């Protein structure tokens, strides 16, 4: 069983690291999703998608648990 | 893009409430399950298949505005 709701995927990986600045959260999306990813919400709201394997995506992710 | 789509990993069992659906759309052929979004007053994304009658019933309704 799972929600009968929508729940976000991400078929794309953002190139380049984002400004760390313009991030203030982030969750991995559900392992139902066909790709893993994790999803940085900016200061503007937005979210962007990114490739959990990238060093600077693991690093953003430790930042942003200690902050 | 590397924005977030929604996807569908359940349908909804029971037909929902025509009432208060506002619109639908079909989920990203991306999405491994096809299906279509009935999109509440409230704004909850419900999945439902799109095999079932009900759903088509509802689709047609919504096209025939
Ligand atoms: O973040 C949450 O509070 C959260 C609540 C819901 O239970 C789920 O939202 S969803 O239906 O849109 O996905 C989700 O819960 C779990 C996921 O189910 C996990 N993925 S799974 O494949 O192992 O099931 C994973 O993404 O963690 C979240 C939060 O614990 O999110």
Redesign the interface.
């Known amino acids: ?15 380049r690291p984002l400004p760390r600045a313009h991030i203030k959260e982030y969750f991995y ?2 392992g ?3 790709n893993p990813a994790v ?1 940085f919400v900016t200061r503007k709201n937005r ?4 490739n959990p394997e990238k060093k600077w995506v693991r690093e953003y992710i430790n930042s942003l648990e200690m902050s």
Do not use: G, M, N, W
């Open positions: 069983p799972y929600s009968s709701d929508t729940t976000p995927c991400c078929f794309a990986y953002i190139a999306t559900s139902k999703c066909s999803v979210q962007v998608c990114a």
